[PDB]
Design a protein around this ligand. Structure first.
Ligand SMILES: O=C(O)[C@@H](O)[C@@H](O)[C@H](O)[C@@H](O)CN1C[C@@H](O)[C@H](O)[C@H]1CO
Ligand SMILES: *[C@@H]1O[C@H](CO)[C@@H](O)[C@H](O)[C@H]1NC(C)=O
Ligand SMILES: [Zn+2]
Length: 1014
């Protein structure tokens, strides 16, 4: 195993280091606005050394953006694919590449048998080539690596099954900036090459000058280079034809033959394309070859990539003809004129890369190594695209909730084979596809039109119902005596109880468990733990009486706490946002202990008075002019007081101090230790008056953020033995700090309401000497070092916070973990800030054609971890990575993969069992079973189950925390006959494993295994 902490990799280009030295000046470079006037030596090419040009036709099909997936399919894409099949079938030298498998699958299944055979032969013969092969071309900023892998797998599994091909070349031309998480997943999925486009214009200029646009991209912590994936970064401002033939768009536009008039389209540089003929072909070729040779100067080999395409192109039959025939004329003339020393032809992406690598092996070139990422993207001037790190935050949070449900449904149902009548495969397929579709760079990114966001949300809501049905049927099967198990596959044995989604305040969707001495006295509840180690976590349920006690299934009492159910309302009468307590239901809380990847059953029983093992929280309402708050049968009266500082401590954990406005002020780790200043504050950013306006994509603040005026907010304090909290109703936000004895949990119920042209940010102010350094994660997979640069505007210093961020000095670290991707930064030493929501009334000119005015209440969740780190073994000052401690990693896990809760729906569960998985191995804390998926249907003689194992890297800080079982996923299910290491998509066997034992992986590595069973 490589050491990912102490050996700083030596690479030719390290993006953080490049960022430190680069100038980022935005000067007019001539026709190539953001470059320079390229020049070439005409004698560089001759008969023995020609320029091989590959023109690769393509069509960017967004799965939802301005139209919904289905509307684009009906009005556009089905015609693109139908005409592609026809044209390629009839024109054998023509080529075309295809990226979005969601669309291709949709298409293919509406095809007649004869067309399917035709389609398969143009794929087999190489004319139609799939690039990447993912269900979509995912966003790279907000997406979790688990879902990037999920959608890549959904598309490639479809391609292998139906087209019998697995792409090894990736094409990502539209994501708004790029992540090293991609080469990481791709390289472990059999890929050999990848292409990217949207990177900072300054970076493009800088790398082009050094001919470093093609590089071996390795992970920032990879000293050896085993993760390296050859990468081609396109050099210009866009992937359209005007910006892909060469440096001058006025010239390249004349070579987009769809712009002569009958298609509506035109050249904004004022010169239109003209049909090629014998009279003008020489003059046209002169212009075109000149462009190619200039573009060729920016790269190292004599092989040139020339994409030919744009959004939803190759739709009309006449369009196929006008592009094909004109380019064929150009090719015939150019290739026959020795003096150009050029051999040009239509080609595919893989043809291009194969030719480049042949040249490389011929010693014609050597490529540089690079590590780092490509965020935050700006396509021009000061237009940094950091607004989409936060846009439509409701759905961003929904993404993470569905990510987890999918994982839990596939894992719970993988333990058995199911009869087709149960429709398990069918429901999981739908859940996987709706979630995969949302990874699209206009889905999770929050950059689609209002009704298209609605379409994605409705699809994820059906996916969530599908997962719940699979999960509850599975739990019923795993915890009912076999000889009693009698399933009705359309019945609800259990209903899921979720405390954080949609969230209290967003939607009253939780069911109350109704008990009564004169009716039903008890109720079974079941917790599932998808993680591969024993886990204890407090779980809460709503009950109809405060007098309830908890037992495990051997009837051992379990300590519990009951609290009122508090909800907040903007009292548009005394003009306050204040809490109300339920007089009809209550919350019971207790610690559930659940086996690794297993289940645990508990029983809640009502009594007529205080039970022996249940305690009650005290409640304090702080506001001047208080009024009473009745709580039905709750046994303790609410206490009142004037606003004041307060301090709390649950168990032996930290003591937190709060301001009189109910916000965190300081944290004291132990009895003795000091009160570390850590203050939460909410501020707002506005939009510029004149000039470029912020929009769904762009964040263009009219200056630093200004404090939200709070007034005298109402603070609610709940103090219990197991859980305490401090909640405050602020304008636009009900902010809550919850304590269970470890790092606190923070929840914000954000409702920007009608605050047009406003972005609400949540900031943490500390005195940690962080300087200009901070850390953010990439796709929930790794943490990268960021350096705030004052030579860049504020918006350029915002980065994706997909799951976490932290700042530290020599002794102290503050890490903020999130349950949803949002934008964020450290704008000053000791500060961390993360955007909560943004309402924008103007369009930001990137084609969306609307602002963001469809905001809705959303419950954001976080864990806040203050830690001493002077004793931790950290990477050197020069290392570009950072790593979490054990506590922060477990805190991220508690947000992304909590215990699932099921309430038995009927009165009596006959044959109920108390636990499942008590014999599963409890693996080391840095190891996770990211995916567990049965890959075969029940009629298959040999069952196959796939596992994706991921090991993160946690800092050594002096806490032994040892003694753990080795997890061998291949022996989790009985009767194993074979165990294989495979690509992460499970599509290719890479190693036959001895003894059918799957070894554990190294820190920061991810592996896949498939176990076969008789
Ligand atoms: O085709 C052009 O005119 C290009 O410059 C592109 O603008 C092209 O429309 C496309 O990339 C626009 N992309 C499409 C969509 O997926 C994005 O949100 C959006 C952001 O601008
Ligand atoms: C699938 O591709 C393989 C090459 O790996 C080929 O040998 C096989 O015949 C193909 N199967 C089908 C259904 O054409
Ligand atoms: Zn796009």
């Amino acid at each position: 195993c490589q050491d990912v902490v102490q050996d700083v990799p030596n690479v030719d280009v390290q993006m953080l280091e490049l960022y430190d030295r680069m100038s980022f000046k935005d000067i007019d470079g001539g026709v190539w606005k953001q470059g320079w006037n390229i020049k070439y030596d005409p004698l560089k090419y001759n008969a023995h050394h020609k320029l091989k040009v590959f023109v690769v036709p393509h069509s960017h099909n967004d799965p939802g953006w301005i139209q919904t997936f289905e509307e684009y399919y009906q009005h556009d894409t089905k015609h693109i694919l139908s005409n592609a099949l026809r044209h390629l079938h009839d024109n054998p030298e023509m080529k075309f590449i295809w990226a979005e498998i969601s669309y291709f699958a949709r298409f293919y299944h509406d095809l007649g048998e004869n067309k399917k055979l035709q389609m398969k032969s143009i794929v087999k013969n190489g004319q139609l080539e799939f690039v990447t092969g993912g269900w979509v071309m995912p966003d790279e900023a907000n997406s979790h690596w688990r879902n990037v892998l999920l959608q890549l797998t959904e598309g490639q599994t479809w391609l292998k099954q139906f087209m019998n091909v697995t792409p090894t070349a990736s094409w990502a031309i539209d994501p708004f900036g790029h992540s090293p998480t991609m080469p990481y997943i791709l390289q472990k999925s059999g890929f050999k090459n990848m292409l990217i486009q949207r990177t900072h214009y300054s970076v493009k200029k800088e790398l082009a000058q050094q001919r470093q646009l093609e590089f071996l991209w390795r992970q920032i912590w990879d000293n050896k280079g085993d993760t390296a994936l050859f990468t081609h970064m396109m050099p210009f401002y866009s992937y359209d034809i005007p910006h892909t033939c060469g440096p001058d768009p006025k010239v390249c536009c004349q070579f987009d033959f769809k712009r002569m008039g009958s298609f509506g389209l035109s050249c904004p540089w004022k010169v239109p394309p003209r049909t090629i003929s014998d009279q003008n072909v020489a003059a046209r070729s002169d212009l075109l070859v000149d462009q190619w040779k200039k573009k060729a100067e920016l790269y190292r080999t004599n092989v040139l990539l020339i994409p030919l395409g744009d959004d939803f192109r190759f739709k009309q039959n006449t369009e196929w003809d006008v592009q094909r025939v004109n380019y064929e004329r150009l090719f015939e003339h150019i290739n026959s004129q020795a003096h150009f020393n050029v051999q040009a032809q239509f080609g595919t992406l893989q043809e291009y890369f194969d030719a480049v690598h042949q040249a490389e092996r011929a010693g014609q070139a050597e490529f540089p190594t690079l590590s780092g990422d490509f965020f935050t993207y700006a396509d021009r001037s000061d237009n940094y695209w950091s607004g989409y790190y936060t846009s439509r935050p409701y759905h961003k949070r929904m993404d993470r909730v569905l990510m987890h449900y999918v994982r839990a449904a596939e894992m719970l149902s993988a333990w058995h084979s199911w009869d087709g009548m149960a429709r398990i495969e069918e429901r999981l397929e739908q859940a996987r596809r709706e979630l995969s579709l949302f990874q699209h760079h206009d889905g999770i990114t929050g950059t689609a039109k209002t009704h298209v966001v609605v379409d994605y949300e409705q699809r994820m809501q059906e996916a969530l119902k599908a997962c719940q049905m699979v999960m509850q049927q599975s739990v019923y099967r795993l915890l009912t005596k076999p000889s009693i198990y009698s399933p009705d596959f359309s019945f609800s044995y259990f209903t899921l109880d979720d405390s954080r989604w949609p969230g209290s305040g967003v939607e009253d969707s939780r069911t109350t468990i109704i008990l009564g001495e004169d009716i039903l006295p008890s109720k079974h509840v079941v917790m599932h733990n998808t993680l591969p180690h024993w886990r204890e976590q407090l779980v809460d349920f709503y009950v109809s009486s405060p007098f309830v006690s908890v037992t495990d299934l051997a009837n051992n009492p379990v300590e519990a706490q009951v609290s009122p159910v508090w909800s907040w309302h903007h009292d548009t009468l005394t003009k306050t946002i204040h809490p109300q307590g339920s007089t009809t239901k209550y919350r019971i809380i207790f610690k559930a202990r659940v086996p690794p990847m297993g289940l645990a059953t508990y029983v809640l029983t009502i009594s007529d008075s205080k039970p022996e093992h249940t305690s009650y929280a005290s409640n304090l309402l702080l506001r001047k002019n208080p009024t009473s708050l009745p709580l039905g049968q709750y046994p303790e009266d609410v206490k009142f007081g004037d606003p004041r500082e307060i301090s709390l401590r649950v168990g032996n954990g930290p003591t937190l101090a709060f301001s009189e406005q109910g916000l965190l002020k300081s944290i004291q780790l132990t009895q003795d230790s000091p009160h570390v200043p850590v203050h939460f504050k909410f501020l707002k950013y506005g939009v510029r008056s004149h000039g470029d306006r912020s929009g769904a994509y762009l964040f263009l603040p009219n200056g630093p953020a200004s404090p939200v005026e709070l007034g005298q907010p109402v603070v609610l304090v709940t103090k219990g033995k197991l859980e305490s909290s401090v909640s405050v109703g602020l304008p636009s936000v009900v902010h809550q700090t919850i304590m269970r004895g470890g790092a606190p949990e923070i929840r914000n119920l954000v409702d920007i309401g009608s605050l047009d042209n406003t972005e609400i940010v949540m900031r943490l102010e500390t005195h940690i000497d962080s300087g200009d350094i901070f850390y953010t994660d990439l796709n929930g997979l790794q943490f990268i070092k960021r350096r705030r640069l004052d030579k860049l505007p504020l918006q350029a210093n915002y980065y994706p916070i997909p799951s976490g961020m932290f700042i530290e000095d020599a002794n102290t670290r503050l890490t903020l973990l999130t349950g949803q991707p949002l934008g964020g930064s450290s704008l000053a030493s000791g500060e961390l800030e993360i955007m909560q929501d943004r309402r924008l009334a103007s369009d930001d000119e990137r084609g969306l054609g609307q602002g963001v005015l469809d905001n809705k209440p959303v419950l954001h969740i976080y864990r806040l971890v203050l830690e001493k780190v002077n004793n931790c073994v950290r990477p050197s000052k020069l290392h570009p990575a950072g790593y979490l401690t054990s506590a922060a990693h477990k805190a991220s896990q508690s947000l992304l993969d909590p215990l699932d809760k099921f309430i038995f729906a009927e009165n009596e569960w006959i044959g109920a069992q108390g636990q499942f998985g008590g014999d599963h191995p409890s693996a080391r804390e840095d190891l996770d079973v990211s995916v567990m998926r049965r890959l075969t249907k029940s009629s298959a003689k040999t069952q196959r189950v796939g596992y994706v194992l991921h090991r993160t890297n946690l800092m050594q800080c002096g806490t032994p925390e040892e003694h753990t079982q080795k997890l061998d996923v291949c022996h989790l299910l009985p009767n194993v006959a074979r165990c294989e290491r495979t690509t992460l998509t499970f599509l290719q066997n890479l190693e036959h494993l001895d003894g059918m034992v799957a070894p554990e992986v190294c820190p920061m590595e991810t592996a896949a295994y498939v176990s076969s069973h008789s």
